XYZ file of N, CA, C and O in Angstrom:
328
model
N -143.897 52.188 -55.650
C -143.744 51.713 -54.454
C -144.728 52.187 -53.762
O -145.625 52.425 -53.896
N -144.235 51.729 -52.177
C -145.654 52.403 -51.215
C -145.023 53.480 -50.545
O -143.993 53.926 -50.230
N -146.247 54.217 -50.449
C -146.470 55.627 -49.888
C -146.775 55.906 -48.401
O -148.345 55.672 -48.853
N -146.273 56.059 -47.309
C -147.157 56.496 -46.210
C -147.433 57.901 -45.454
O -146.359 58.340 -45.919
N -148.364 58.354 -45.298
C -148.727 59.619 -44.504
C -148.930 59.329 -43.025
O -150.137 58.483 -42.737
N -148.305 59.966 -42.236
C -148.751 60.353 -41.260
C -149.515 61.730 -40.576
O -148.823 62.971 -41.235
N -150.715 61.971 -40.377
C -151.044 63.175 -40.213
C -151.720 63.280 -38.646
O -151.914 62.702 -37.862
N -150.849 64.467 -38.390
C -151.021 64.977 -36.843
C -151.316 66.297 -37.073
O -151.556 67.477 -37.418
N -152.141 66.875 -35.711
C -152.478 68.451 -35.674
C -151.077 69.068 -34.961
O -150.084 68.051 -35.112
N -151.422 70.411 -34.618
C -150.473 71.266 -34.338
C -149.324 70.812 -32.756
O -148.679 71.222 -32.767
N -150.386 69.745 -31.786
C -149.721 69.613 -30.652
C -149.143 68.360 -30.976
O -149.091 67.200 -29.711
N -148.791 67.129 -32.624
C -148.488 66.202 -32.159
C -149.126 65.214 -32.269
O -148.918 64.196 -32.077
N -150.351 65.719 -32.191
C -151.705 64.454 -31.965
C -152.016 63.833 -33.275
O -152.439 64.714 -34.218
N -152.211 62.492 -33.385
C -152.275 61.818 -34.724
C -154.255 62.295 -35.091
O -154.505 62.444 -34.465
N -154.394 63.054 -36.334
C -155.718 63.096 -36.717
C -156.146 61.643 -37.521
O -156.036 61.369 -38.247
N -157.360 61.151 -36.741
C -158.277 60.086 -37.043
C -158.968 60.783 -38.190
O -159.934 61.871 -38.068
N -159.307 59.613 -39.358
C -160.360 60.198 -40.271
C -160.019 61.575 -41.085
O -160.893 62.100 -41.866
N -158.408 62.117 -41.082
C -158.558 62.947 -41.782
C -158.320 62.663 -43.311
O -158.187 61.322 -43.680
N -158.809 63.569 -44.200
C -158.678 63.131 -45.889
C -157.255 63.460 -46.486
O -156.754 64.562 -46.192
N -156.732 62.659 -46.809
C -155.444 62.435 -47.765
C -155.801 62.236 -49.262
O -156.264 61.311 -49.639
N -155.432 63.379 -50.223
C -155.298 63.643 -51.355
C -154.088 63.098 -52.080
O -153.203 64.106 -51.579
N -153.776 62.304 -52.910
C -152.516 62.105 -53.794
C -152.831 62.807 -54.729
O -153.563 62.346 -55.658
N -151.857 63.963 -55.265
C -152.094 64.259 -56.582
C -150.736 64.356 -57.261
O -149.800 64.750 -56.617
N -151.015 64.677 -58.776
C -149.984 64.624 -59.817
C -150.025 65.901 -60.655
O -150.951 66.052 -61.149
N -148.677 66.078 -60.900
C -148.594 67.578 -61.454
C -148.569 67.524 -62.988
O -147.986 66.696 -63.484
N -149.591 67.795 -63.784
C -149.998 67.893 -65.067
C -150.521 69.346 -65.739
O -151.144 69.903 -64.809
N -150.147 69.631 -66.790
C -150.476 70.942 -67.335
C -150.968 71.892 -66.234
O -151.884 72.821 -65.953
N -149.769 72.271 -65.739
C -149.252 73.317 -64.286
C -150.698 73.329 -63.200
O -150.754 73.925 -62.803
N -150.995 72.254 -63.050
C -151.805 71.976 -62.003
C -151.503 70.353 -61.052
O -151.369 69.863 -61.908
N -152.606 70.216 -60.053
C -152.518 69.191 -59.770
C -153.524 68.634 -59.409
O -154.829 68.830 -59.181
N -153.813 66.834 -59.972
C -154.922 66.474 -60.095
C -154.937 65.212 -59.228
O -153.949 64.518 -58.999
N -155.896 65.071 -58.355
C -155.778 64.197 -57.218
C -156.187 62.768 -58.235
O -157.268 62.343 -59.271
N -155.398 61.945 -57.437
C -155.025 60.677 -58.100
C -155.822 59.429 -57.101
O -156.168 58.207 -57.560
N -155.848 59.661 -56.215
C -156.627 58.702 -55.021
C -156.517 59.426 -53.764
O -156.276 60.550 -53.355
N -157.839 58.937 -52.850
C -158.330 59.713 -51.590
C -158.254 58.558 -50.667
O -159.028 57.719 -51.149
N -157.757 59.115 -49.897
C -157.269 58.077 -48.270
C -158.202 58.821 -47.494
O -158.289 59.548 -47.111
N -158.301 57.978 -46.330
C -158.562 58.569 -44.832
C -157.747 57.927 -43.810
O -157.324 56.793 -43.890
N -157.291 58.661 -43.078
C -156.477 58.213 -41.947
C -157.258 57.354 -41.121
O -158.287 57.298 -40.594
N -156.410 56.159 -40.499
C -156.762 55.256 -39.373
C -156.790 55.799 -38.121
O -156.491 57.073 -37.776
N -156.839 55.304 -37.120
C -156.868 55.767 -36.013
C -155.672 56.366 -35.392
O -155.676 57.136 -34.384
N -154.538 55.713 -35.927
C -153.558 56.306 -35.977
C -153.030 57.713 -36.345
O -151.626 58.381 -36.066
N -153.796 57.765 -37.333
C -153.459 59.173 -38.128
C -152.882 58.750 -39.599
O -151.854 59.549 -40.005
N -152.487 57.267 -39.814
C -151.998 56.797 -41.071
C -152.742 56.711 -42.370
O -153.995 55.830 -42.101
N -152.296 56.926 -43.534
C -153.177 56.703 -44.932
C -151.496 56.243 -45.454
O -150.351 56.906 -45.335
N -151.937 55.197 -46.765
C -150.915 54.218 -47.267
C -151.401 55.036 -48.658
O -152.615 54.588 -49.378
N -150.473 54.674 -49.827
C -151.020 54.371 -51.105
C -149.778 53.476 -51.764
O -148.377 53.638 -51.725
N -149.991 52.623 -52.695
C -149.184 52.114 -53.496
C -149.139 52.522 -55.242
O -150.179 52.605 -55.623
N -148.286 53.355 -55.135
C -148.283 54.104 -56.791
C -146.846 53.909 -57.826
O -145.839 53.392 -56.972
N -146.853 54.250 -59.137
C -145.662 54.378 -59.503
C -144.770 54.954 -59.129
O -145.336 56.393 -58.370
N -143.272 54.928 -59.049
C -142.204 55.758 -58.503
C -142.401 57.460 -58.972
O -143.035 57.258 -60.196
N -142.232 58.252 -58.579
C -142.824 59.572 -58.502
C -143.012 60.402 -57.588
O -143.342 60.048 -56.529
N -143.259 62.183 -58.108
C -143.366 62.942 -57.123
C -144.927 63.171 -56.949
O -145.640 63.257 -58.044
N -145.546 62.975 -55.827
C -147.330 63.697 -55.592
C -146.773 64.352 -54.636
O -146.150 64.957 -53.847
N -148.061 65.439 -54.712
C -148.157 66.515 -53.806
C -149.590 65.685 -52.589
O -150.580 65.099 -53.188
N -149.368 65.587 -51.507
C -150.005 65.019 -50.732
C -150.821 65.792 -49.871
O -150.270 66.950 -49.269
N -152.230 65.933 -49.725
C -152.885 67.018 -49.418
C -153.548 66.795 -48.168
O -154.743 65.741 -48.626
N -153.620 67.008 -47.060
C -154.282 66.300 -46.001
C -155.099 67.314 -45.253
O -154.886 68.526 -45.262
N -156.596 66.930 -45.050
C -157.359 67.852 -44.586
C -158.430 67.118 -43.392
O -158.633 66.134 -43.764
N -158.853 68.068 -42.502
C -159.656 67.366 -41.702
C -160.496 68.527 -40.727
O -159.835 69.731 -40.786
N -161.976 69.076 -41.211
C -162.456 70.013 -40.597
C -161.903 71.215 -40.874
O -161.946 71.949 -40.093
N -161.349 71.450 -42.339
C -161.350 72.952 -42.841
C -159.703 73.485 -42.193
O -159.488 74.358 -42.283
N -159.119 72.184 -41.582
C -157.800 72.320 -41.163
C -157.157 71.648 -41.840
O -157.775 70.684 -42.530
N -155.989 71.900 -42.703
C -154.868 71.120 -43.748
C -153.499 71.404 -43.548
O -153.377 72.507 -43.272
N -152.628 70.386 -44.221
C -151.440 70.610 -44.499
C -151.190 69.630 -45.858
O -151.860 69.116 -46.290
N -149.953 69.778 -46.020
C -149.637 69.279 -47.608
C -148.183 69.050 -47.546
O -147.249 69.587 -46.924
N -147.498 68.100 -48.190
C -146.021 67.884 -48.956
C -145.846 67.196 -49.834
O -147.072 66.430 -50.329
N -145.020 67.000 -50.612
C -144.502 66.271 -51.821
C -144.053 64.701 -50.920
O -143.516 64.782 -50.342
N -144.250 63.422 -51.858
C -144.181 62.638 -51.666
C -143.425 62.222 -52.612
O -144.265 62.311 -53.519
N -142.171 61.827 -52.446
C -141.524 60.948 -53.710
C -141.661 59.296 -53.511
O -140.837 58.933 -52.685
N -142.772 59.170 -54.157
C -142.751 57.402 -54.290
C -141.504 56.870 -54.513
O -141.083 56.732 -55.759
N -141.172 55.961 -53.585
C -139.847 55.159 -54.547
C -138.454 55.730 -53.272
O -137.601 55.025 -53.738
N -138.818 57.066 -52.779
C -137.662 57.644 -52.269
C -137.728 58.093 -50.720
O -137.295 57.967 -49.931
N -138.898 58.189 -50.607
C -139.425 59.172 -49.398
C -140.062 57.782 -48.791
O -141.273 57.114 -49.629
N -140.447 57.454 -47.518
C -140.690 56.324 -46.728
C -142.310 56.572 -46.077
O -143.362 56.007 -46.418
N -142.067 57.521 -45.605
C -143.469 58.099 -44.989
C -143.148 59.505 -44.601
O -142.183 60.106 -44.072
N -143.990 60.318 -44.989
C -144.455 61.753 -44.774
C -145.198 61.811 -43.344
O -146.500 61.708 -43.419
N -144.672 63.042 -42.689
C -145.065 63.266 -41.815
C -145.894 64.832 -41.864
O -145.317 65.390 -42.736
N -147.555 64.620 -41.907
C -147.960 66.165 -42.260
C -148.347 66.820 -41.136
O -149.497 66.133 -40.566
N -148.220 68.033 -41.178
C -149.014 68.736 -39.548
C -150.277 69.556 -40.303
O -150.057 70.703 -41.005
N -151.366 69.332 -39.929
C -152.443 70.319 -40.169
C -152.404 71.496 -39.267
O -153.116 71.987 -38.472
N -151.510 72.302 -40.020
C -150.990 73.541 -39.632
C -151.775 74.514 -39.915
O -151.209 75.917 -40.058
N -152.735 74.627 -40.729
C -153.393 75.665 -41.520
C -154.999 75.909 -41.783
O -155.718 74.640 -41.546
């Protein structure tokens, strides 16, 4: 299915051109399978096999992450809160 990501800063503002890595868990670690950059609205999308991915969003050393269940979750909002 399709998995969409919204990346915002701590003040709810969309982050343009944040790096968005989608990772799959294997052998006790997460392996990046795709790398996207958010558009001017703070959105990035991936089409992939149904399944759980860790989504890792970063911009200039600020970062946030969450699980996206592809085929169950439609759009994940990630707060670059770290």
